[PDB]
Structure 1
Amino acid sequence: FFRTRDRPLRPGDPYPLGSNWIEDDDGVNFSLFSENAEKVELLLYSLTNQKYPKEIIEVKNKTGDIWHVFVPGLRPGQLYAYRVYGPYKPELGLRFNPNKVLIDPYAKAINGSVIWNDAVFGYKIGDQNQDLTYDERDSGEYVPKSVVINPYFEWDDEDFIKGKKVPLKDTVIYEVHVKGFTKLRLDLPENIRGTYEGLASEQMISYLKDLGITTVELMPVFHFIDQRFLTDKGLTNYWGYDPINFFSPECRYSSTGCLGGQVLSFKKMVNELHNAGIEVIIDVVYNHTAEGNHLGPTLSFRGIDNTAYYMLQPDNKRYYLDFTGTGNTLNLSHPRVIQMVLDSLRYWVTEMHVDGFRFDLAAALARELYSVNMLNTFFIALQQDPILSQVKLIAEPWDVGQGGYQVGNFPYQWAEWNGKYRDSIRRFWRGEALPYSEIANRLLGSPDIYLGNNKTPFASINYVTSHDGFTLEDLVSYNQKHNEANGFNNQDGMNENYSWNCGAEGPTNDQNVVICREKQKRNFMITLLVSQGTPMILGGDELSRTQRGNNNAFCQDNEITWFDWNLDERKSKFLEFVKKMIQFYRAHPAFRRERYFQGKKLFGMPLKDVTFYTLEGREVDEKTWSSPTQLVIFVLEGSVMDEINMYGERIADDSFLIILNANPNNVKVKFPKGKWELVISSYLREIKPEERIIEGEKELEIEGRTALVYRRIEL
C-alpha cells in the first residue's frame, strides 16, 4: 500500500527520445513522444518474469508533447515496455488501448518477437464490429520487451576509414541476406551461420575481398515481425520488409542474442568489414510498419499516438491510406515522425557506422495526402543535414500508389534503382528488338533519365536481378513464376518477368539448353559490368543461386533461399567469370565515369569519346538510331574522355569496341578502322584462333546471343 511517489524518482529529460543509460546519475532516462495520450505508464520487467511488470512507474512529467521520467538504479540490460492511455474512438482515428503493452519506438534493442495471440489487437477479433470494438485482454506476455543498452563500443581501426573511401563512381554493390548468406556455410561453426557475426568472418570477408565487390547492401535489419497470416501457414518473414522498430537490429540474426547482443553483434560486423575496406549499405523500410491496417495488431505506434505516425483517410480517419501495399503508410508529414526517421538515420550512421541506405519504396516517403512531392519537408531536412549530407542515399524510385513512379525525380545526392535498365536489358537479350536508342542510352548510364536533373551516371544503379523477382539463374531458367511454396495459390509475384527458359522450364539435361543459359548468364554479366553507371550484383548470382523459379521468395526461410556453396564444374567456372569481369570493370576508368559521354570530338582530338556503329561498318544515323535492333556496337575512346580526377588530371583509358548481339541467329559485323585484340566474350567454346584479332576494317561472324569486347591496340 504505497504511492507512485513513495518511489525515488526524477523528472528526467525530453531528449533524447527513448531510454538512456546515464552513467553519472546511476539511472535511466525514459523519453516517449505522444501528443494525444492522456496518461503513460513505464513498465519494468525482469529477466525471468516477463508476463507481468516487476514494477509500474507512471510517467507524470511532460515537456510539450513528450512524457519523460528518470528512474534511479536502472542500468543497461533492463527490460521495459509502455502502456498508453487515451481516447478510444476508431471512427475518429483514436485507438488508445491501455491494456495493450507497447514497444518503445526508440528502443535500440528488442527482446524476442511476438507470440501471436488474439490479445495483441486491441479490438475483439471474432467480433462482427471488428476494429470498431475495444478488446481489454492484457497482452504483456506476448509482446517482446524493449531493452535499455550500453552504447559504448570501441571502433578499433574505426576512425581512419573515414576518409577517401569508395566513391559511388568506382563502387560495385553486392546485395546480401545476412542469414541466407551463411546459413549453409559449414565452413563456419554453426550458430554464427546466418548471423551478423557470420557475415563478417575471415572466411566470408576473404570471399568478398576475392569476389571484388566494394560495398555490401544488407537486406532489412530493422527488427521486424512475422505477419500472422504467414505464421498461420507454417511460414516466416524471411526478407524482413515489415519493420516494427527503426533503431533496433533484428534479433534473429544475432549470435549473442537478443538482449543487447544484437547491436553489439552488429557493430563488430561493420567494424570487421571496414577493416577490410568494405562499405555497408542497409535496406531501409520507412514507408510502412508491421502494424498493417485496421484489423491489424496494436504493438507500438498505433497505441502510443495513432493520429500521428500513420496516414489516415482524411474523410474517415478510421482507415489507413496505403501507398505501400502493406496495410498502412508512415505519416512522413508529422514533425515527430520526420524527426524519428531522421534520428534513426543519424543513429545508424554515427552509432552503427552504416555508410549508406537503400530506401525501399522511396516514393512513399514523398507522399502528402494523395500527391507525391519530391520537395516535401522530410527530404529537404535530410538534404541540409550535416551528418546525412555525407552518406550514400539510394532509392526505389517508386511506390505502388497512383502516380508513384518517381524515376529521375529524386534530389541530388540520390542514386536511384534503374528499373528501365533492368527491364530493357532483360528484354534485349531475351530476343525483343528495341530501338537502337533505348539500349545505347541504357548502355551509357541512361543520360535521358537523369541528365534532365543534373545527375550523373552514378545516380543510375544498374542491375539485371534482385531479391525482387528472379535470380540470374532463374532468369534464364523459367518463363513463368513458380511461387506455389508461398501458400498463396501462386497468386503473388510479378507476372511479366521478361524472362526466358532457353527452351524449357526448370532444371534440364539437354546440353544445348544448359549451354544457352550459361551463355546468357555471361551476356547479362558482360553488359552490367560494361554499362556506364553503378552496377549491382545480386548476392549469389556468382554461385548461380536458384530459388526454383520462385520470383517472390519473401517468406521462404529455408533451402530455397539459403546460399548453396557446393559448387560443381559449371556453377564454379562461372564464379571465375564474374570475378574476372568485375576486375575488368574496376581496372578501367572508361566505365566508372563521373561525366556522361557526349557524341563528339573533345580536346581537339580526331576521334569521338564514343561512337555507335551498325552491323556493317557504319556510324548510326537519325533513322537507324530510332529504329529497333538486336545488335548494338559501340566504341569508347579511352583517351578522348572528359574525365578529371580530384587532382585535376584528365584520365585516359584504352579504346574499346563492345559488340552486343541479342539476335537469335548469327551475324557478320564489319570492324571499324584499326586493330582489335579480343578481351572477354560469351563463348564457352575454345575461342577460334581467327577471332583473337581483327584488322583492316574486315569482318567476322558472330553466333546469336553473344557479347564481345575488343581493345584497339593499333590505329
Structure 2
Amino acid sequence: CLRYWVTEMHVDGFRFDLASIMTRGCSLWDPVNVYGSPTTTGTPLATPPLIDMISNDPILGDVKLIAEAWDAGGLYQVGQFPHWKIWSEWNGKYRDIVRQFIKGTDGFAGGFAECLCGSPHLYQAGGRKPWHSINFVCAHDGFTLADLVTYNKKYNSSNGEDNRDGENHNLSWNCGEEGEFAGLSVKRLRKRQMRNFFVSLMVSQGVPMFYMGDEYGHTKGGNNNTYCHDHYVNYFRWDKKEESSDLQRFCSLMTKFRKQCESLGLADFPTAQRLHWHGHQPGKPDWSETSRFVAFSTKDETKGEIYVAFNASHLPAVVGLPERPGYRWEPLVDTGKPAPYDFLTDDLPDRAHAVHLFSHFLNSNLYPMLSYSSIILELQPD
C-alpha cells in the first residue's frame, strides 16, 4: 500500500498514526504455534519486522517516515521508536516542555534549551539528527494555538460523551481570565504568547510542524477533541484570517527568517563553537529550577550572528547583550511590540526611525523586554 501511494500517487512521505502498535508482535510467534508447545501477542519488539521492512525497503526507505510513537494501550516510545537511523517522530516531549516553559512554569529552562537544540538527549545517542525530531506545539488533536492561550481546561460537552474526551493534561494557560471575553491586557498577553510559541517553533533545531489555522489564531471554543464535527469549528476561516492578518504576517515573516538563517535548519546538533548560552547577562545562563529565562547567540554564515531570548517570567527585564567590539545589535523581532513592529522589515518606511528610537538602549548593549516575550536581534557591523 505504501509503495502504491509513493509510485502511483507521487506522495513524498507518511505520518503513521499510533505507530507504536506497529511494534507489537503477533501471535504467530507464541510458542504454541511455533514448536507446537511451550513472546506473546501484543508484546513490543526491539526490531519489529514491519518497521524493518519499511525502513529498508528500496522505495520507502528514502521517503519521510514520521511516527506517532505511542498508542492507547499504554505504550510510549518517544526517542525509542525502532528507527534504523531513518524514522522521524512526533516529538511530544518537545510539545510538553515548550508548553510548560512558555506558560511560566518552574524547572523547564534546561529542558527548553534542550528542545531548542533538537532534543540531543533523545536522538543524538541513537544516531539520529536534529531534523528527525518533528517539533510541534499544537496538532489536530488537542488545543489549537489560540485555545492554548485562552482555556485552562477542555470543553468537550459537544462531543456528547459527558466531556470525557481528549487530553486532560493540556499544560495550557488562559493568560489570566478564561474565555474569549477578557480585558485588553489579557488579549495583548495572548497575542504575545501566540507569537512566542511560533518563535520558539521557528528557532528550534528540527522540523517545525503546525496545524492549519494556527497562523491566524483559529479557535475551536475550548474543544480539544473535534473529531465528530462537520461545521465551521473545524473549517479554515478565510474571513477570520483577514481580521487577524497581523499574526499571519508575523508567522510568514518568522518562516522566511528561519529559511534565511543558515544556523536554524542545521543538519547536525548545535555545538558550543556556534551556540552560546546567556542569561540576563551574557555568558551566565540560569539553569536553576526558578529560572524562566533562556537566551542564546548563534553564529550565522548569512546573518553574521543572531541573538534569541525568551523571557517566560512575569517580570520585565533589561537584558544585556553580548559584547562584540566593532559591532551593534539591530532589532529584528520583538513579540511585545505592536504590529507591524513585532517584526521589522524593509517594507516599513519608518524602520530606521523605529530602530533609532531604541538606539539608546542598543548602544549600551541592552534590550528592555516585557514579561512573557521573546526577542531576536542580528549583529550588524558598526
TM-score, L = length of structure 1? 0.47
Q: CA separation in 1, counterparts of 2:303 and 2:264?
A: 9
**1:434 and 1:628 in contact (8 A); partners too:** yes
- The answer for the alignment partner of 1:679 in structure 2 is 332
Q: Whose radius of gyration is greater, 1 or 2?
A: 1
Q: CA separation in 2, counterparts of 1:438 and 1:526?
A: 17
Q: CA separation in 2, counterparts of 1:375 and 1:630?
A: 40
- The answer for the alignment partner of 1:517 in structure 2 is 190
Distance 1:380 1:693, change over 3 A: farther
Distance 1:689 1:683, change over 3 A: farther
- The answer for the alignment partner of 1:349 in structure 2 is 6
Which of 274, 283, 299 is equivalent to 1:609? 274
**1:597 and 1:609 in contact (8 A); partners too:** yes
Distance 1:696 1:506, change over 3 A: closer
Q: CA separation in 2, counterparts of 1:509 and 1:499?
A: 16
- The answer for the alignment partner of 1:589 in structure 2 is 262
Q: CA separation in 2, counterparts of 1:513 and 1:695?
A: 29
- The answer for the alignment partner of 1:387 in structure 2 is 59
Q: CA separation in 2, counterparts of 1:578 and 1:692?
A: 26
Distance 1:468 1:704, change over 3 A: same
Query: Which one has the bigger helix percentage?
Result: 2
- The answer for the alignment partner of 2:317 in structure 1 is 667
- The answer for the alignment partner of 1:402 in structure 2 is 74
RMSD: 2.0
SS in 2 for 1:517: helix
Distance 1:466 1:351, change over 3 A: same
Deviations 1:433-484 (A, max 9, x none): 2243211110111111100111001101011111010001111111010111
Per-residue deviation at 1:499? Answer: 0.7
Q: CA separation in 1, counterparts of 2:99 and 2:357?
A: 31
- The answer for the alignment partner of 1:578 in structure 2 is 251
Deviations 1:594-638 (A, max 9, x none): 111121xxxxxxxx3010012123344xxx435442100101011
Per-residue deviation at 1:560? Answer: 1.3
Q: CA separation in 2, counterparts of 1:504 and 1:689?
A: 36
- The answer for the alignment partner of 2:371 in structure 1 is 704
Per-residue deviation at 1:496? Answer: 1.1
Query: Does residue 1:372 correspond to 2:62, yes or no?
Result: no
Q: CA separation in 2, counterparts of 1:505 and 1:577?
A: 25
Per-residue deviation at 1:697? Answer: 6.0
SS in 2 for 1:449: helix
Distance 1:692 1:362, change over 3 A: farther
Q: CA separation in 1, counterparts of 2:145 and 2:124?
A: 29
State the percentage of identical aligned residues.
Answer: 35
SS in 1 for 2:308: strand
Per-residue deviation at 1:695? Answer: 5.0
- The answer for the alignment partner of 2:95 in structure 1 is 422
Per-residue deviation at 1:409? Answer: 3.0
Q: CA separation in 1, counterparts of 2:235 and 2:46?
A: 37
Q: Read off the aligned partner of 2:216 and give its amino acid letter.
A: L
Alignment map for 1:106-505 (pairs within 5 Å): 344-368=1-25, 369-411=41-83, 412-505=85-178
Deviations 1:219-258 (A, max 9, x none): xxxxxxxxxxxxxxxxxxxxxxxxxxxxxxxxxxxxxxxx
- The answer for the alignment partner of 2:297 in structure 1 is 635
**2:65 and 2:86 in contact (8 A); partners too:** yes
Distance 1:700 1:653, change over 3 A: closer
Distance 1:476 1:406, change over 3 A: closer
Segments of 5+ residues of structure 2 without an aligned counterpart are 26-40, 342-353
State the number of aligned residues.
Answer: 349
Per-residue deviation at 1:692? Answer: 5.4
**1:663 and 1:705 in contact (8 A); partners too:** yes
SS in 1 for 2:82: coil
Q: Which has the higher contact order (CA 8 A, sep 6+)?
A: 2
**1:425 and 1:439 in contact (8 A); partners too:** yes
Alignment map for 1:50-65 (pairs within 5 Å): none
SS in 1 for 2:151: coil
Per-residue deviation at 1:372? Answer: 1.4
Q: CA separation in 1, counterparts of 2:228 and 2:91?
A: 25
SS in 2 for 1:573: helix
SS in 1 for 2:220: coil
- The answer for the alignment partner of 1:654 in structure 2 is 304
- The answer for the alignment partner of 2:380 in structure 1 is 713
